[PDB]
């Protein structure tokens, strides 16, 4: 009853800001992602 | 975990003997076993090796065809038979246990050992630099060791072992693979190396750090201990 | 009831206001990843029947897998060796957990019990360390917080946070309509999300133990759930052949992933280390990869003869392991 | 290029693979049986006479089977590698429920391509129930007076034609619902069993000796 | 004259050296095929390969040219090995038939009785008996027929497997008779559209065995008993029939079934 109402009274923000933050985090680590650009076959332990 | 030996004594030249190491307190069938001997006034040397399942056996080049080793898992005890006792066959023996998988700690427990007295080669060589070091409590020790060949493998493993024998006790494992601490050892000890020059470093010294320090290698199976280094307070 | 509806109309009304733009329009300039190719490097064999769960290790080399014959196996991912092989008491197990410290392994299933096994004992065997039993349904997920804290989601509409030395429940979580399907912890360790068979996903709180938020955009039950690496989003996959991206601060659905050629349900959803690829399992003998931003296909991990029942990406992102009902684990690079 | 420790690691792995192969063999000579049933069905007597998860490890003629009861839309996915299912339904008391349930189980996606054994349990109390007259079974299905068994009945005992019609109408209902769909995929095997009677084991032994034989014949391309 | 005996008579060597080793490749390489019943097929393909590599290429043109152009240093072995290898094929078939029988008359304990040890035992026994008979009958003592002492033992040793095979396949047909009847219910068009498959499947194998191995031994037994007409031109086709048996021996028991066909298709392809 009342709890559900009470519960819906909390801080929010625009969708675009959150999408931009997610995009920024995704771009921030692109160069450490082996599954995007495959590593040359001399640094992984699954060579051959 | 408890390994107890049975056998030994005074024997005539040319005779034969049988020694039995019995284990009670751990899962025997998952462990490989070794025998290691020590001379009355010298270091340690390797004598034999038997795997789990008896699918691989090694002996020493000295006694390649005079001793035999076999185990009884249902009876839960290992033993060896000794024939043609030379004048060098007088020593005191221990049975050691080890296990091999990714990240294990081989040679992690030693037995008590029993004494046997007799009446009247391309192998890696380890050199212990200083045979005696004078120390005082609360200072650093920098024991060193030199190796004939680089011990590091292609993957990265090193295969260097540090043992510390007290006066009146069997050796105990301190560091395996030159960098990893043992289970029940304090964080005082540390080890390092660069393939050939190996160093064991102690920061703070207490009264229980008195004894002999031995090294060891495990790269090629004929494995040699080293002379040692004595520490006194 | 009128007061609750009042809010219900109003919260919805409140939320509409929050939205200002979609995701496709903003991320148009983001160039597509393209086509992605991965090839099998190992094929782990030794499981008799179909396998249900797997979980990587912190060192990124050991892994654990659970099968329906009553088998847990710990695999060395480099040399294909078999470090340990443990038998379970109940042949029906749906979940396994590998501790962050590498000392313990957890399992559970129809037996209504969660078992904690000690790995690095003083012998060559692995024995039972703890036996948690306080539920009346089937477990579907259990995760380690530390060597002492474990969170288990069960089929009896309850999620429990336990204490291992004692063996009794410490914080119980209630509020779901159906049985709980999946669960995932946040990297910041403070929160975690849960998904049950009521098309709704629910956040929780570790210490106080209250449902802080609730998300609903699906049609049927949700089978799998996982966090985004950042800790401010997550993703769900449900029986209606759809994936959904949900946000925590925005409290609104972000993006949906589905194509007209998929009819089967989704069983496992997992993220890459960075958070650019989304690996989704399926029942049509496949396992697909989605671009998590532009919502497009980016290749297929074909090669299985049955449904893909478990997926796991290593911590540093150099491999992905995939299990199936054909009883063969495949490692991909 | 293997060190002195990698060799022992691989030897340990191979020693584990031995045991795994030893288990895979014995896993292929065992037949698993999921046990469905209703609340009041007399499954307890059957599982006692053959002996969450409730288990049964009975064996017959040097072959071993493992029976397991559960406790449904969620955990049925697990049970599709079983040989067959011994469904138990009550007979000598009011059925529209049970028929419904049979009709839902027979059409399940994860339970297709599996034959169903069907025990009609507790017939012993059906003999008396129709012996007391009154309104036995006809009030709920107004077709017992209108259904007539053919001459091919061959009753085992023939103590009363009335109980014969009573048995055969419900058996025909179940058989009809079985054959009204499925494309020859699987087959129902009905039986009349009670609580007291000794052997519902052979029956299970002689069954699933026909299913695997039929599969065998279909594989070898002569059926 | 026209060498029309080249093509036909030479359409078996190829098919027994190109279509025969693929069975061994697809039995050793793939994984769900290592099964005690696929070892008795690899061994039979090996015997047929040994026949088709050695005897058929050397005896082909020989039967055509009617002149010996190779020397007597191999002829001896040619008689010694052929009577071992060819017979081996027959000694395999019996065992395979028993296999099939034990898979139909007893489907519950089939994995528990047909283990790899029994398959290897059957292979070893067949090979050893064939080689022992060849080394004791021919080695001790460009060809010549048998005398009036070993023909009886060559006849009984052939009749025993024939009797076993026909009895077992008859029982298999009788078992498949009464389960096309229960499944249907009887419709005349339905207990006859189902009862034809098994008849065709068993008849093809039985015919391929009997029509190839009967005339030669029947003709040999007659001549030995009395009236040894034995025209030179009649004795070549008699042995060519037994030779050409292996040209299709590894087509009935391998290419018939679907899984072997799929393995062969994969191996022939990329």
Q: Does residue B127 sit in the same domain as residue B73? A: no
CA distance C18 to chain A (A): 6
DSSP B33-102: EEEEEE-SSS-EEEEEEE-TTS--EEE-STTTTTEEEEEETTTTEEEEEE-S--STT-EEEEEEEE--ST
Give the minimum alpha-carbon distance from B155 to chain D in angstroms, rounded to a whole number.
10
Breaks (C-N over 2.5 A) in chain B follow: 120
C-alpha–C-alpha distance, residues E150 and E217, integer Å? 13
Is residue B5 located within the same domain as residue B104? yes
Interacting residues of C49 by C-beta distance below 8 A, sequence separation 6+ = C67, C68, C69, C327, D27, D81
Query: Which residue(s) pair with B197 in the sheet?
Result: B146
Cβ contact D17–C46 (<8 Å): yes
Segment 1-48 of chain A within 8 Å of chain C by CB: 1-2, 4-5, 7-8, 10-16, 18-23, 25-26, 29-30, 32-36, 38-39, 44-46
Whether D216 and E175 have beta carbons less than 8 Å apart is answered as no
Binding residues of E for spermidine: 82-83
> Does any CB of chain C come closer than 8 Å to the CB of residue B156?
no
Q: Are strands B17-23 and B3-6 parallel, antiparallel or unpaired?
A: antiparallel
Candidates D170, D201, D175; CA nearest to D57 is D201
Tokens at residue D71, please? 């406790």
Is residue B163 in some structural domain? Answer: yes
Please list, residue by residue across C147-176, b when 16 or more beta carbons sit within 10 angstroms of its beta carbon and e when fewer do. Answer: eebbbbbbbbbbbbbbebeeeeeebebebb
Contact indicator for B34, D8 with CB cutoff of 8 Å: no
Distance from CA of C272 to the nearest CA of B (A): 27
What kind of experiment solved this structure? cryo-EM
Q: Check residue D154 and give left, alpha or beta (phi > 0: left; psi -120 to 50: alpha).
A: left
Full residue range of the structural domain in which residue D135 is found: 4-220
Q: How many CB pairs under 8 A join B and D?
A: 35
Residues B96 and B128 in one domain: no
Same-domain check for residues B132 and B189: yes
Q: Which of B80, B101, B119 is the last residue of a domain?
A: B119
Total domains in the fold of chain E: 1
Question: Which of D3, D7, D16, D54 is best to mutate for the C interface (most C CBs within 10 A)?
Answer: D16
Tell me how far the alpha carbon of residue E226 is from its chain's centroid: 30
Contacts of residue C4, defined as CB under 8 A and 6 or more positions apart, other chains included, come to A1, A4, A5
Numbered residues of the known binding site of E: 82-83
CA torsion C181→C186→C191→C196, rounded to 10°?
A: -10
Q: Which of B119, B144, B165 is the last residue of a domain?
A: B119
Judged by DSSP in three states, C8 sits in helix
Burial category of E184 from C-beta neighbours within 10 Å (exposed 0-12, middle 13-18, buried 19 and up): middle
What is the C-alpha to C-alpha distance for residues E50 and E59, in angstroms, rounded to an integer? 14
Residues whose CB falls within 8 Å of the CB of residue C297, separated by 6 or more in sequence, listed in order: C259, C288, C289, C290, C291
Enumerate long-range contacts of D194-198, CB under 8 Å, 24 or more apart.
D194/D121, D194/D122, D194/D123, D194/D124, D195/D42, D195/D45, D195/D121, D195/D122, D195/D124, D196/D124, D198/D49
Q: Are B218 and D15 inside 8 Å of each other by CB?
A: no
Q: Please tell me whether residues B2 and B112 are part of one structural domain.
A: yes
Domain end call among B119, B152, B169: B119
Q: What is the CATH number of the domain that holds D155?
A: 3.40.50.300
Chain D partners within 8 Å of C111 (Cβ):
52-53
Structure tokens at E41: 């097929």
Q: How many domains does chain D have?
A: 1
DSSP letter string, C287-311: EEEEETTT--EEEE----SS---EE
E-strand ranges in E52-207 read: none
d(CA C146, CA B61): 50
CATH architecture of C1-332: 7 Propeller (2.130)
Structural domain that includes position B41: 1-119
Strand segments, DSSP code E, in D36-152 are: 54-56, 59-60, 63-69, 84-90, 115-121
Q: Which of E103, E111, E201 sits opposite D221 (nearest CB)?
A: E201
In a domain, B232, yes or no: no
Q: Among partner residues E176, E183, E258, which is closest to D222 by beta-carbon distance?
A: E176
Which positions in chain D touch B51 (Cβ < 8 Å)? 8, 11
Per DSSP, which regions of C127-213 are E strands? 127-132, 139-144, 150-154, 158-162, 169-174, 180-185, 192-196, 200-203
Give the DSSP per-residue string, A1-48. Answer: -HHHHHHS------HHHHHHHHHHHHHHTGGG-TTTSPPPTTTSSS--
| C-alpha dihedral (E163, E169, E175, E180), degrees to nearest 10 | -150
Residue entry with tokens 């590698």:
D81
Residue E246 neighbours by CB distance under 10 Å:
28
Do B100 and B155 sit in the same domain of this protein? no
Please give the C-alpha separations between residue D122 and each of D43, D178, D211, in angstroms, as whole numbers: 11, 21, 26
What's the gap in Å between the CA of B33 and the closest CA on chain D?
Answer: 12
């Amino acid at each position: 009853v009342e709890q559900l109402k009470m519960e819906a009274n909390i801080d929010r923000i625009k969708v675009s800001k959150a999408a931009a933050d997610l995009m920024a985090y995704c771009e921030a680590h692109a160069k450490e992602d082996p599954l995007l650009t495959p590593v040359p076959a001399s640094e992984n332990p699954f060579r051959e | 975990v408890q390994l107890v030996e049975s056998g030994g004594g005074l024997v005539q030249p040319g005779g034969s003997r049988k020694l039995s190491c019995s284990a009670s307190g751990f899962a025997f069938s998952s462990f490989g076993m070794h025998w290691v001997r020590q001379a009355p006034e010298k270091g340690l040397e390797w004598v034999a090796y038997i795997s789990s399942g008896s699918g691989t056996i090694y002996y020493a080049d000295t006694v390649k065809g005079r001793f035999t080793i076999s185990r009884d898992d249902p009876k839960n005890t290992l033993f060896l038979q000794m024939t043609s006792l030379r004048s060098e066959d007088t020593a005191m023996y221990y049975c050691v246990r080890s296990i091999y998988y990714y990240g294990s700690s081989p040679f992690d427990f030693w037995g008590q050992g029993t004494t046997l007295t007799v009446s009247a080669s391309a192998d890696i060589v380890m050199t212990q630099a200083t045979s005696s070091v004078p120390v005082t409590p609360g200072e650093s020790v920098s024991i060193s060791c030199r190796s004939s060949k680089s011990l590091l493998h292609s993957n990265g493993n090193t295969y260097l072992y540090w043992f510390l024998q007290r006066p009146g006790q069997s050796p105990q494992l301190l560091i395996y693979r030159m960098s990893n601490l043992a289970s029940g050892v304090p964080d005082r000890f540390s080890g390092s190396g660069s393939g050939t020059a190996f160093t064991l470093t102690i920061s703070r010294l207490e009264a229980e750090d008195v004894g002999v320090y031995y090294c060891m290698q495990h790269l090629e199976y004929p494995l040699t201990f080293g002379a040692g280094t004595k520490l006194e307070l | 009831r009128q007061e609750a509806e009042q809010l219900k109309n109003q919260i919805r009304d409140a939320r509409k206001a929050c939205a200002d733009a979609t995701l496709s329009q903003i991320t148009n300039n983001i160039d597509p990843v393209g086509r992605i190719q991965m090839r099998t490097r190992r094929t782990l064999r030794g499981h008799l029947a179909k396998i249900y769960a797997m979980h990587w290790g912190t060192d990124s080399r050991l892994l654990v897998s659970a099968s329906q014959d009553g088998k847990l196996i710990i695999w060395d991912s480099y040399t294909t060796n078999k470090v340990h092989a443990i038998p379970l008491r109940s042949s029906w197990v749906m979940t396994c957990a590998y501790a962050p410290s590498g000392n313990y392994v957890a399992c559970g299933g129809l037996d209504n019990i969660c078992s904690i096994y000690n790995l690095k004992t003083r012998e060559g065997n692995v024995r039972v360390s703890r036996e948690l039993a306080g539920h009346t349904g089937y477990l579907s997920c259990c995760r380690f917080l530390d060597d002492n804290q474990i969170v288990t989601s069960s089929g009896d509409t309850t999620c429990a946070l336990w204490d291992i030395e004692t063996g009794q429940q410490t914080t119980t979580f209630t509020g779901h309509t159906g049985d709980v399907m999946s669960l995932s912890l946040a990297p910041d360790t403070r929160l975690f999300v849960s998904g049950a068979c009521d098309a709704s996903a629910k956040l929780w709180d570790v210490r106080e133990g209250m449902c802080r938020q609730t998300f609903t955009g699906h049609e049927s039950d949700i089978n799998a759930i996982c966090f985004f690496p950042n800790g401010n989003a997550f993703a769900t996959g449900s029986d209606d052949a759809t994936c959904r991206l949900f946000d925590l601060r925005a409290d609104q659905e972000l993006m949906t992933y589905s194509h007209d050629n998929i009819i089967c349900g989704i069983t496992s959803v997992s993220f890459s280390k960075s958070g650019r690829l989304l690996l989704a399992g399926y029942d049509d003998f496949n396992c697909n990869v989605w671009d998590a931003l532009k919502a497009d296909r980016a290749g297929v991990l074909a090669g299985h003869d049955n449904r893909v029942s478990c997926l796991g990406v290593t911590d540093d992102g150099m491999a992905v392991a995939t299990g199936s009902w054909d009883s063969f684990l495949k490692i991909w690079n | 290029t293997l060190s002195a420790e990698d060799k022992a690691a691989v030897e340990r792995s191979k020693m584990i693979e031995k045991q795994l192969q030893k288990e895979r063999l014995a896993y292929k000579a065992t037949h698993r049986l999921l046990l469905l049933g209703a609340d009041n069905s007399g499954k307890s007597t059957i599982v006692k006479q053959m002996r969450g998860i409730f288990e049964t490890r009975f064996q017959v003629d040097k072959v071993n089977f493992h029976m397991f009861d559960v406790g449904r839309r969620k955990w049925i996915q697990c049970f599709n590698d079983v040989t067959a299912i011994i469904y138990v339904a009550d007979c000598s008391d009011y059925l529209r429920e049970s028929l419904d349930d049979f009709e839902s189980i027979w059409n399940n996606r994860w339970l297709r391509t599996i034959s169903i054994i069907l025990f009609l349990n507790k017939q012993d109390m059906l003999a008396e129930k129709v012996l007391a007259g009154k309104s036995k079974i006809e009030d709920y299905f107004p077709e017992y007076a209108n259904y007539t068994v053919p001459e091919d009945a061959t009753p085992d005992a023939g103590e009363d034609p009335k109980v014969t019609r009573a048995k055969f109408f419900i058996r025909d209902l179940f058989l009809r619902i079985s054959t009204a769909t499925g494309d020859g995929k699987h087959y129902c095997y009905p039986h009349f069993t009670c609580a007291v009677d000794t052997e519902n084991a052979r029956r299970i032994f002689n069954d699933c000796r026909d299913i695997i034989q039929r599969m065998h014949l279909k594989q070898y391309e002569l059926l | 004259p026209r060498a029309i005996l080249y093509g036909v008579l030479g359409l078996g060597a190829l098919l027994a050296v190109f279509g025969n080793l693929l069975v061994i490749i697809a039995i050793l390489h793939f994984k769900q095929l290592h099964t005690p019943t696929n070892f008795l097929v690899a061994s039979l393909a090996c015997a047929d390969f040994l026949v088709g590599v050695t005897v058929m290429p050397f005896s082909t043109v020989r039967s055509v040219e009617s002149c010996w152009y190779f020397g007597e240093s191999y002829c001896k072995f040619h008689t010694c090995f052929d009577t071992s290898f060819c017979f081996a094929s027959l000694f395999h078939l019996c065992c395979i038939s028993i296999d099939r029988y034990i898979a139909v008359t007893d489907p519950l304990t089939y994995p528990t009785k047909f283990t790899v040890s029994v398959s290897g035992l059957c292979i070893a026994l067949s090979w050893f008996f064939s080689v022992t008979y060849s080394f004791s009958i021919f080695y001790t003592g460009c060809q010549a027929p048998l005398n009036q002492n070993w023909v009886l033992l060559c006849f009984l040793l052939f009749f025993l497997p024939t009797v076993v095979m026909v009895f077992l396949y008859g029982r298999i047909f009788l078992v498949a008779k009464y389960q096309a009847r229960k499944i249907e219910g009887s419709y005349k068009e339905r207990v006859a559209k189902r009862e034809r498959k098994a008849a065709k499947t068993l008849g093809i194998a039985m015919a391929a065995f009997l029509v190839s191995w009967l005339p030669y031994i029947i003709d040999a037994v007659i001549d030995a008993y009395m009236n040894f007409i034995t025209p030179a031109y009649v004795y070549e086709i008699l042995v060519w029939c037994v030779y050409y048996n292996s040209a299709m021996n590894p087509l009935i028991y391998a290419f018939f079934y679907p899984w072997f066909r799929k393995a062969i298709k994969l191996i022939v392809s990329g």
